[PDB]
Amino acid sequence: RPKLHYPNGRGRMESVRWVLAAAGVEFDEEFLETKEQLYKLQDGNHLLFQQVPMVEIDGMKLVQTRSILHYIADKHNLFGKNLKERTLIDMYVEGTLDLLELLIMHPFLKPDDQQKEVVNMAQKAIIRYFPVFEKILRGHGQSFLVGNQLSLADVILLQTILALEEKIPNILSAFPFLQEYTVKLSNIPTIKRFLEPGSKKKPPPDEIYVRTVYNIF
Amino acid sequence: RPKLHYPNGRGRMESVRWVLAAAGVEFDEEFLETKEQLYKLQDGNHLLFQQVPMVEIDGMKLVQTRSILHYIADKHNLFGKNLKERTLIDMYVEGTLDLLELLIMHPFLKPDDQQKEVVNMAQKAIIRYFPVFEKILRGHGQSFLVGNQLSLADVILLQTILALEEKIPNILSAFPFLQEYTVKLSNIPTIKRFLEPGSKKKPPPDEIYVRTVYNIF
Numbered sequence: 077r078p079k080l081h082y083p084n085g086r087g088r089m090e091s092v093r094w095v096l097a098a099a100g101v102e103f104d105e106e107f108l109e110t111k112e113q114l115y116k117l118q119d120g121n122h123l124l125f126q127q128v129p130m131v132e133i134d135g136m137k138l139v140q141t142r143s144i145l146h147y148i149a150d151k152h153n154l155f156g157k158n159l160k161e162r163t164l165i166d167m168y169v170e171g172t173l174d175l176l177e178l179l180i181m182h183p184f185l186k187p188d189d190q191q192k193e194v195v196n197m198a199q200k201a202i203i204r205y206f207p208v209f210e211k212i213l214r215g216h217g218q219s220f221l222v223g224n225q226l227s228l229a230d231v232i233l234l235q236t237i238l239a240l241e242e243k244i245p246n247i248l249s250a251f252p253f254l255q256e257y258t259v260k261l262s263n264i265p266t267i268k269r270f271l272e273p274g275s276k277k278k279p280p281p282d283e284i285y286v287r288t289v290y291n292i293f
Numbered sequence: 294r295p296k297l298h299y300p301n302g303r304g305r306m307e308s309v310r311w312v313l314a315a316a317g318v319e320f321d322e323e324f325l326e327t328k329e330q331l332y333k334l335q336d337g338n339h340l341l342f343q344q345v346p347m348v349e350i351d352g353m354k355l356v357q358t359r360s361i362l363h364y365i366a367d368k369h370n371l372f373g374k375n376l377k378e379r380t381l382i383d384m385y386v387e388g389t390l391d392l393l394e395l396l397i398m399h400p401f402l403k404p405d406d407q408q409k410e411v412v413n414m415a416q417k418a419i420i421r422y423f424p425v426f427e428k429i430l431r432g433h434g435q436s437f438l439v440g441n442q443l444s445l446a447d448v449i450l451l452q453t454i455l456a457l458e459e460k461i462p463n464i465l466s467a468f469p470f471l472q473e474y475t476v477k478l479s480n481i482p483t484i485k486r487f488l489e490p491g492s493k494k495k496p497p498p499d500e501i502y503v504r505t506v507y508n509i510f
Contacts, residue, residue, distance in 0.1 A: 125388045126421055136380075140387035142359065147380055163353075163364055170357035171342045204343050 078103035079132040081117065083292060085285040086278040088141050088180060089129050091173075093277060094235045095145055095228065097270035099152040105276065114292050142173070149228040161223045168209075168221060168229035175205050176236045179243075183281045184289075198244050206251050209233065213253040219260050226264070234261050242280060295320035296349040298334065300509060302502040303495040305358050305397060306346050308390075310494060311452045312362055312445065314487035316369040322493065331509050359390070366445040378440045385426075385438060385446035392422055393453045396460075400498045401506075415461050423468050426450065430470040436477050443481070451478050459497060 078096065082089040084107040096103050108114055108128065118126050124139040131138045134151070138144045149155040149165075156162045178197045185193060212221055221229045237258055240247050248255050262271060270277050295313065299306040301324040313320050325331055325345065335343050341356040348355045351368070355361045366372040366382075373379045395414045402410060429438055438446045454475055457464050465472050479488060487494050 124384065125391075125425065138380075138384070140384045143380070143384045143387050146383060147376075150376060159367065163355075163360075166363060167341065167355070167357050167360045170360045174342075208341065 080105045081108065081122075081130040081132075082128045083108045083285065083289055084278070085281050085289070087129075087281075087289070090278060091141065091176070091232060091235055092129060092131060092144055092148075094231050094270070095148050095154065097275065097277070098226070098231050098264070098266045099148060099154065100266040101148075101152070103276070108292050109288060111292050142170075145169075145228060145232075154226060154228040154231070156223055156227055157225075161227075164222050165227045165229045169232050171205065171208075172229070172232045172236055175200055176232070176239070179236070179239050183286055194243050197240060198247060201240055201244075201247055202250070206248075206254055209257075210251045210253045213257055219257065226261075230261060234258065234267070297322045298325065298339075298347040298349075299345045300325045300502065300506055301495070302498050302506070304346075304498075304506070307495060308358065308393070308449060308452055309346060309348060309361055309365075311448050311487070312365050312371065314492065314494070315443070315448050315481070315483045316365060316371065317483040318365075318369070320493070325509050326505060328509050359387075362386075362445060362449075371443060371445040371448070373440055373444055374442075378444075381439050382444045382446045386449050388422065388425075389446070389449045389453055392417055393449070393456070396453070396456050400503055411460050414457060415464060418457055418461075418464055419467070423465075423471055426474075427468045427470045430474055436474065443478075447478060451475065451484070 078101065080089060080092065080103060082105070084105075093103075108117075114128075117123055117128075117130070122137055123130050124137065127139065129139065129141055129144065131144050133144075133147070138147060146155070156165050175197070178193065178200070182190065182193060209221065218224045220226055221233065237248065237254065248258065261267060269275060295318065297306060297309065297320060299322070301322075310320075325334075331345075334340055334345075334347070339354055340347050341354065344356065346356065346358055346361065348361050350361075350364070355364060363372070373382050392414070395410065395417070399407065399410060426438065435441045437443055438450065454465065454471065465475065478484060486492060
């Protein structure tokens with residue numbers, strides 16, 4: 077049973093929860109709340125590079141989010157069936173992660189900048205990303221980005237889109253394919269559950285989380 | 294023959310040149326110098342997500358540096374021989390990239406901050422990274438980080454270490470294993486060449502590059 081190390085919040089660990097969940101893998105969590113708990117962690121030589129996310133899985137202590145996600149994907153058929161597949165998934169993933177980031181950084185912005193920034197997400201999404209995906213989808217008619225099966229790209233995309241919708245509720249408006257895709261995915265049972273209550277799915281970060289994060293580091 | 298799109302400078306494309314070179318793969322370059330050349334590129338629908346690096350390879354237009362490096366690695370046995378291997382390489386790579394970044398951002402700093410920042414690289418390297426590697430090496434006695442063969446992790450590490458040494462010439466001092474490793478690697482012919490003159494190996498970014506970069510974007 078995979079163990080997740082991280083503060084209790086979304087952060088960067090979210091995508092991990094997301095994948096795990098989708099894979100229908102149950103896992104546990106050990107929360108950081110202090111610099112000190114962190115210290116012990118590092119002190120124990122648990123964090124390969126002194127930082128979290130760290131995930132204990134398959135007798136390993138994985139670090140590096142991308143690294144981790146790739147592991148799990150590979151452990152559960154979320155990584156395609158060949159190089160070409162793999163390759164796409166990969167790029168889709170990296171690109172998305174780039175957008176997701178804005179979300180990730182958001183909370184630590186100077187409230188004033190927070191706003192400007194929302195507007196910016198909106199534009200990148202609309203302009204840079206959503207279109208790519210819409211097209212892909214539009215052009216193969218399948219319910220998955222790649223190879224007619226759920227992949228890592230789908231989960232990150234989903235993750236992100238929702239997250240974005242939390243800030244810009246209508247962002248999808250011009251992307252009827254993306255809308256459909258989103259719906260269906262969310263219907264996948266694992267996901268459906270994850271989305272439901274009492275999931276390890278974290279909420280949008282609050283003042284506290286931030287504080288704490290600032291505290292731990 | 295792979296074609297590299299990017300301004301004429303190191304930037305993030307460097308690691309690509311590095312890997313290509315090490316793989317002993319010849320490739321070409323198309324330089325960006327203007328917003329406009331960029332526009333056409335995007336206009337043509339060449340940049341999957343509107344940005345560079347972009348690399349034309351194997352009839353593809355790869356984008357996302359990590360994405361690309363993984364491709365090439367996979368095309369040339371720089372990615373290990375199994376999941377466990379792969380997995381390490383991956384993490385080593387991600388971690389290194391994190392350090393390399395400092396280098397990457399460096400030039401665009403307010404000269405005043407540039408200095409503070411050097412000091413910081415020094416510390417992270419010394420404290421966070423170098424030690425991990427030294428240990429690894431120290432503990433298996435091999436000339437490669439992973440599986441007794443050159444991998445992607447080795448190239449990025451090399452890349453970075455040198456780059457760092459360009460700013461903090463003695464950074465390696467306390468890491469006799471890392472020193473040895475570095476030497477030997479640099480002796481690998483491909484590399485040796487890459488390091489020699491008339492290689493596609495770019496130099497440390499100058500005022501111009503910066504300017505240009507600022508210009509293109």
